[PDB]
Amino acid sequence: SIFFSPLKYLGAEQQRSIDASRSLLDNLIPPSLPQYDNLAGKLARRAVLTSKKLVYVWTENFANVKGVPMARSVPLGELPNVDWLLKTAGVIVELIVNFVASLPASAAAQFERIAAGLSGDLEAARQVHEALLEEAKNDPAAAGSLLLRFTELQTRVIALLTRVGLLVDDILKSASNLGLNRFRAVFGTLRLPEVADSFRDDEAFAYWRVAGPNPLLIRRVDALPANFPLGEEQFRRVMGADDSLLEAAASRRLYLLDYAELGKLAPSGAVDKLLTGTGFAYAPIALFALGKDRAGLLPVAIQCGQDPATHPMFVRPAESESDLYWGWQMAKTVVQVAEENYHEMFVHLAQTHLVSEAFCLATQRTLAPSHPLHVLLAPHFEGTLFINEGGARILLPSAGFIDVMFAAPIQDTQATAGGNRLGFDFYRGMLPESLKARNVDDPAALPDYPYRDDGLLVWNAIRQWAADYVAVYYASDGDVTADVELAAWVGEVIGSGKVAGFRPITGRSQLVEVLTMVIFTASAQHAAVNFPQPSMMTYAPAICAMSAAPAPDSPSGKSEADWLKMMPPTLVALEKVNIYHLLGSVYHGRLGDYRQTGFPYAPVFSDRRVTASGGPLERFQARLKEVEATIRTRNQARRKPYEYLLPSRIPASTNI
Ligand SMILES: CCCCCC/C=C\CCCCCCCCCC(=O)OC[C@H](COP(=O)(O)OCCN)OC(=O)CCC/C=C/CCCCCCCC
Ligand SMILES: [Fe+2]
Ligand SMILES: [Mg+2]
Hints:
By secondary structure, the chain is mainly alpha-helical. The chain has helices at residues 5-8, 12-27, 39-55, 82-102, 105-108, 112-138, 143-173, 181-185, 195-198, 202-211, 232-239, 245-250, 322-366, 372-377, 384-395, 401-405, 410-423, 431-437, 450-473, 477-481, 484-495, 508-530, 533-536, 560-564, 570-583, 608-611, 616-637; strands spanning 58-59, 70-71, 219-220, 254-258, 271-273, 277-279, 285-290, 297-303, 313-315. Helix content is 54%, strand content 5%.
């Protein structure tokens, strides 16, 4: 049929090239609020939004994450560009080569030729990338026509990653078939993280609470909870004869970790799995204290569960107390098991990735491409829909990485992470509110808290940027409430996005706070909780989301053998070292850059009022450079550098 004529030669590659070029053409349209657009503009933007709703589609029945608002599928223009594809393929291929090289030669035989070919093709692809960028710099006038060759390279790297996918599945099909030496052996040629040397140290263990992957749970305590019955004699055994619970509470020196919210991620008993044997996890309570000099936090006491009737109190022992040493190491391991569950499922997956999913969808469906807030927000969602589909499909099915690495049955893990996302309150989850609610917002009381102090620098810089940008387009609160696209966006965020606590936006100040939280969550918050993975979470003895043995049943009389029984099977350690290396090794885009991350790396902003010398954008960029210098200076004085919130290391979006 002559009506099939358009379909005869049309493929995904042509369509991607068309999308890529049309994006550049649409970036030049000057942005406007709907009520200030002309009638032709109102008509065109309404038509485009209606079309966008065909391809950006909400579902709450996405595979392996039921109940969580998700994109039904990833639109063509939301696949990662070739810069992200090469970086990620590079990391995965290198990890495969490293793994295969550690297998016995007879086992490696199944994979080594295929991995060598992938490694060769990847090097070829990088050479092409370098050469295309060489040609663009040599003949800038013809750079528009090079976009097509970049699109062709994208096709090639997509195909390579598809073949990597098959190889990884072939490896996992044979996983089973394929005393701390084993936890080093799984690294192969990779260097062990610094935590491997320090993990037994009590002060190191405490520092995780303020400078680790989960800086969000620690809170000041003024009176101990009824279900944590620590006595004064016990407290003085650790803190000295001239201290007391009363004195330490009054002087703001007591801090509590309580993992009650883990729910079914802390199974009530043993969970037996075919691939990993018998596994346990916990919802413990731990007390930390500052010395009177506030030099640093010290762990005082640990109860390995919520009910003191069934969980005895473990109190930090003196160095001489050899009979109490191993029970204490076991109690610390219990807390670290709770930590990987809480961090990965709640702080990372639920509260960054799965929140940003909803703001991405709302933004594409309700704010027109010519809306200044679409222009501002879209760079902060680059690669988000893609990486989250990856999470749901690759990491969360039965026998996948999360079923292996986390103790709970996979259905309970899926449901509990989902429930956490649905319960997460947007306003209460903002950094300054989080700090205030937990009473850890005062540097006099708790001086060494790098997440707070570096985090507030970035939060406030973003806030001032959102204020400057809003002020370009919205002259009054009436302009906010007159914006029909913003009102629709809020409607979808509440109704389809199910973001708890979200509310109508009725003025400029509130709009600024909302935008600050959206941008911070997409960029800095994700960076702070994602990029510690390779340096802090790759070594199983320092942290793992399952234990192979129950919590210690008594503080006294444990041996090294008792503690070793908690260590996970080698398969768990193998999946752990590889996934956490990958997820923290891809830095794609940078907060404040505001250029496309794919060729031709054009400016995000065309409006002269935004891009003016010394204007809103330049003020944000210069502020981030000051923040960078400030943090570098702080890290010279810190016991350990905390680098995760350096702006040079914060991607603009959540894409890994
Ligand atoms: C774990 C807790 C994380 C929680 C946070 C989750 C947040 C979202 C992160 C989502 C990340 C999604 C995971 C993929 C991220 C990589 C980016 C990506 O898009 O990968 C594309 C390819 C192809 O896709 P496809 O659909 O065609 O076929 C999937 C397999 N049937 O997938 C992979 O290579 C699987 C790599 C698995 C990791 C292998 C590690 C190295 C292998 C070394 C040897 C293996 C030794 C065992
Ligand atoms: Fe991530
Ligand atoms: Mg228990």
